[PDB]
């Protein structure tokens, strides 16, 4: 239980230290601190598929999944985090079938990721600066 203990977590981006994950209209973006339950998440590891699952505290029974449009959302009906440094995680895919291993990615315009949705983009190495995030104990 020493690696990513199950419990409350705040997901932030490396680019800005004042942005927190927030699902609006079904799309996850990074918003300023509002001290609300919509910015906190719950991470739980389950061994039936030996993977982690992220849910919204304000929205129970909503699991972070991906759609066919290349986006991510909360479904009412699995991720593989990878650590490269302290408080840095890269959530890779679990399928790996007939394709490569995709991962979470965001678009940055000279240290500016405001109002940018999270996408499922191809991942090759750990030097892609726009792929990892930070999970903070709250």
């Amino acid at each position: 239980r020493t690696f990513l203990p199950n419990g409350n977590y705040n997901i932030k981006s490396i680019f800005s230290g004042s942005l927190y994950l927030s699902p609006v209209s079904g799309s996850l973006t990074f918003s300023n601190e509002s001290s609300a339950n919509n910015q906190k998440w719950n991470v739980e590891y389950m061994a039936e598929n030996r993977c982690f699952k992220i849910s919204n505290v304000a929205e129970p029974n909503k699991y972070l999944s991906y759609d066919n449009f290349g986006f991510i959302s909360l479904d009412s009906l699995y991720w593989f985090p990878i650590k490269i440094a302290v408080n840095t995680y890269i959530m890779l895919s679990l399928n790996k079938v007939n394709e490569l291993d995709y991962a979470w990615d965001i678009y940055d315009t000279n240290e500016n990721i405001l109002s940018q949705p999270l996408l499922l983009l191809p991942n090759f190495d750990i030097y892609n600066s726009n792929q990892m995030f930070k999970l903070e104990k709250i």
């Binding site: 690696f3 490396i14 990878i82 650590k83 490269i84 440094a85 302290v86 840095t88 930070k134």
Partner: protein
């Protein structure tokens, strides 16, 4: 990989000599009352470290647990390393600091052609801005390698540099701030009982 709770004590490992070629029981331990031991790795302290050793299915092994100080119901964990944590064969990983400058660290020097590894961090928040790092040994001569550790669940090891010469090398390398590394040292010329290495962060 053998550790003790949060690595509070530093356990030692010994190999019983001439064991495994005698009475054998599948899936159990059949002690032959062998008292001759061959030291492999381990320190005497208190420091934070864990052993990574290659063990055979035939020989019996001893673990020396030192004089514990606090009765906190200590615990010893053995975990098989089926992943990429195989380059650190028979080595005691020493978990380590902060700020910049020069920091010295002294441990019990291993024998010739023996491995000692240090696990250290790089101060700084977030890829990100890099920092200059130099490593040099005071007395003993050893070859050093530097790896960056990635936790995949288990420990994927990638190689960034090799064949590095210690004993006051002027070489300096750039590492990402906020990252954690393994420095593996193999002593080639033993000149002192204690190994003492300095890290320099700028």
């Amino acid at each position: 990989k053998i550790n003790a709770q949060n690595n509070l004590p530093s356990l030692k490992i010994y190999e019983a000599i001439g064991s495994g070629n005698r009475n054998f029981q599948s899936g159990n331990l059949c002690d032959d009352d062998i008292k001759a031991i061959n030291y492999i790795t381990g320190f005497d302290s208190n420091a934070k470290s864990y052993l990574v050793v290659l063990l055979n299915k035939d020989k019996n092994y001893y673990i020396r647990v030192p004089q514990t100080s606090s009765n906190i119901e200590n615990q010893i964990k053995f975990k098989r390393e089926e992943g990429d944590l195989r380059n650190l064969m028979n080595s005691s990983v020493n978990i380590i600091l902060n700020s910049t400058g020069a920091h010295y660290y002294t441990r019990q020097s291993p024998d010739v052609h023996d491995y000692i590894s240090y696990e250290f961090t790089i101060p700084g928040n977030f890829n990100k801005d890099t920092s200059n790092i130099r490593l040099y040994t005071s007395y003993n001569q050893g070859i050093g390698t530097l790896f960056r550790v990635t936790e995949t669940i288990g420990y994927n090891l990638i190689n960034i540099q090799q064949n590095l010469n210690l004993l006051n090398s002027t070489k300096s390398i750039r590492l990402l701030n906020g990252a954690i590394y393994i420095l593996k040292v193999e002593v080639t010329e033993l000149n002192n009982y204690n190994i003492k290495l300095h890290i320099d962060i700028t």
